[PDB]
Write an enzyme that holds these catalytic residues in place. Structure first.
Site, PDB file in Angstrom:
ATOM      1  N   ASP A 172       1.023   4.439   0.608  1.00  0.00           N
ATOM      2  CA  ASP A 172       0.594   5.388   1.683  1.00  0.00           C
ATOM      3  C   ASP A 172       1.633   5.548   2.840  1.00  0.00           C
ATOM      4  OD1 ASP A 172      -1.033   7.360   2.967  1.00  0.00           O
ATOM      5  OD2 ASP A 172      -2.585   5.953   3.582  1.00  0.00           O
ATOM      6  N   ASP A 222      -0.365   0.531   8.314  1.00  0.00           N
ATOM      7  CA  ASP A 222      -1.362   0.921   7.298  1.00  0.00           C
ATOM      8  C   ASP A 222      -1.158   0.188   5.961  1.00  0.00           C
ATOM      9  OD1 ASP A 222      -3.127   2.571   5.389  1.00  0.00           O
ATOM     10  OD2 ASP A 222      -3.564   3.580   7.272  1.00  0.00           O
TER      11      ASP A 222
END
Ligand SMILES: C#Cc1c(-c2cnc3ccccc3c2)c2c(N)ncnc2n1[C@]12CC[C@](NC(=O)c3cncnc3)(CC1)C2
Length: 299
Positions: A142, A160
């Site tokens: 991601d 993240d």
């Protein structure tokens, strides 16, 4: 023995040790607050960001603590470490405050004052952080401009680890990931390619207007993202190399460190931006004992 023992320390923070000053932002991801962490024994004040979710469930706390695990296991200057957790009914994650927010918002708001030196230094720094995650056998899954945080304009870090795995964002993914759910360090290089394209276009949306279901067909045909106006062929060739069908043909992150750092020595040769020479970027009681979390090392 398959892998080495992860001897990272999960630090548990008392609710009395820190205080939420204000809300920074709200989303689907959760609610992030600005705050101040004061360890009880020490005479320091550490600026922090505290992440809550929107309503307590067992599946939510499972996913929060998996993020905490991975984030507590990293230590590198271009990667966000977890400072600790706080055990509220829903688990709160605590990290370093990054005053300038995420890099995507930064380039959109500061489009008019971002030089070639800054853009190329960010590409190097993200490549260093990603190369570290590859050295730790971690696939990010991601990488995007939204998941890079800005400590200063001179210093960015990757964040993240909610999808990060030890070895959906359709418009950042490699072709093999879309078709077959195959994720490698080389699929993160594709996403690095798209991340660089976001920065060089000052935060444009990739494939804007086109729906996500049409993207796999688009990429199989041979279409890619366009050459940003500011990019030389030298820089755009690096992006195109990140989007090869053959994953082994894409650059390694260590090679991307080299290429961008060579370019960062002579920035106006590789990015062409109008007025590049002119480009400049930057409580009272708190400020007395403020230590940044990067200087507050583990006792
Ligand atoms: C998501 C998040 C996030 C994080 C963060 C990330 N991961 C985490 C993992 C575990 C634990 C905590 C974590 C915290 C973050 C941070 N540490 N320090 C400053 N800000 C942050 N944000 C943002 C929240 C709202 C925000 N708003 C703008 O950037 C903006 C909007 N409009 C005009 N200017 C600026 C977008 C992201 C800042």
């Amino acid at each position: 023995m398959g892998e080495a023992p992860n001897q990272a320390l999960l630090r548990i923070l008392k609710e009395t040790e820190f205080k939420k000053i204000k809300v920074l932002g709200s989303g689907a991801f959760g609610t992030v607050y600005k705050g101040l962490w004061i360890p009880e024994g020490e005479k320091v004040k550490i600026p922090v960001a505290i992440k809550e979710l929107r309503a307590t469930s067992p599946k939510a706390n499972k996913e929060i603590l998996d993020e905490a695990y991975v984030m507590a296991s990293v230590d590198n200057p271009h990667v966000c470490r977890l400072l600790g957790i706080c055990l509220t009914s829903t688990v709160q994650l605590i990290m370093q405050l990054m005053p300038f927010g995420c890099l995507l918002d930064y380039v959109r708001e500061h489009k008019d004052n971002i030089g070639s030196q800054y853009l190329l230094n960010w590409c190097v720094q993200i490549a260093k952080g990603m190369n570290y995650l590859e050295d730790r056998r971690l696939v990010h899954r991601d990488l995007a401009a939204r998941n890079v945080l800005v400590k200063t304009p001179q210093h960015v870090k990757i964040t993240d680890f909610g999808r990060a795995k030890l070895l959906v964002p359709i418009k950042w993914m490699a072709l093999e990931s879309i078709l077959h759910r195959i994720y490698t360090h080389q699929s993160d290089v594709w996403s690095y390619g798209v991340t660089v394209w976001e920065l060089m276009t000052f935060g444009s949306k990739p494939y804007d207007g086109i729906p996500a279901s049409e993207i796999s067909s688009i990429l199989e045909k041979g279409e890619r993202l366009p050459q940003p106006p500011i990019c030389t062929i030298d820089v755009y060739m690096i992006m195109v190399k990140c989007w090869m069908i053959d994953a082994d043909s894409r650059p390694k992150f260590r090679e991307l460190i080299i290429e961008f750092s060579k370019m960062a020595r002579d920035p106006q040769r590789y990015l062409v931006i109008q007025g590049d020479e002119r480009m400049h970027l930057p409580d009272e009681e708190d400020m007395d004992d403020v230590v940044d979390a990067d200087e507050y090392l583990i006792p």
